[PDB]
Design a protein around this ligand. Sequence first.
Ligand SMILES: Cc1ccc(C(=O)N2CCN(C(=O)NCC3CC3)CC2)o1
Length: 119
Amino acid sequence: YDIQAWKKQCEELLNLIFQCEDSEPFRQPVDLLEYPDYRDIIDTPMDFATVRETLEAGNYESPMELCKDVRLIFSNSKAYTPSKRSRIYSMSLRLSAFFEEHISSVLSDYKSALRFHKR
Ligand SMILES: Cc1ccc(C(=O)N2CCN(C(=O)NCC3CC3)CC2)o1
C-alpha cells in the first residue's frame, strides 16, 4: 500500500528496457534527417529517454501517465511503419509485450495503494 513505490519500479523497468536490444530505435528522438517525413505522420514524438527524464524530473504523478507516454512510443512506431514486418516495428511489438508484462503489477499495486489510502 506504498503510494510512491511505482516510481522506483518504473525506474527499474526502464533500466531493463534500456538493456534490451529491441529498445535501441526508441531510446532517443528520430533524426528527422534519416526519416524526413516522420513529423508529417507523427504528431507527438516520444522516446524512452524523454520518459525516463520526465520520471526523474518528478513530472509524472502516477504510473498511468508514464504508461500513456510509453504506449505512445509504440503507437508512433505502428503509425510510422511502412509494413507490419518492418524491422523497427517488429522490435516495438516485442518491447511492448515486455513492457505490458512488467507494468501490469506496477499499475495494480499503485491503484490498490490509492484505494487503501481513500478507504
Ligand atoms: C522504419 C520504421 C518502422 C517504424 C519505425 C519507428 O518506429 N521509428 C522511426 C525510426 N526511429 C529512429 O530513427 N530512431 C533513432 C533514435 C534512437 C536513436 C524511431 C522509431 O521506423
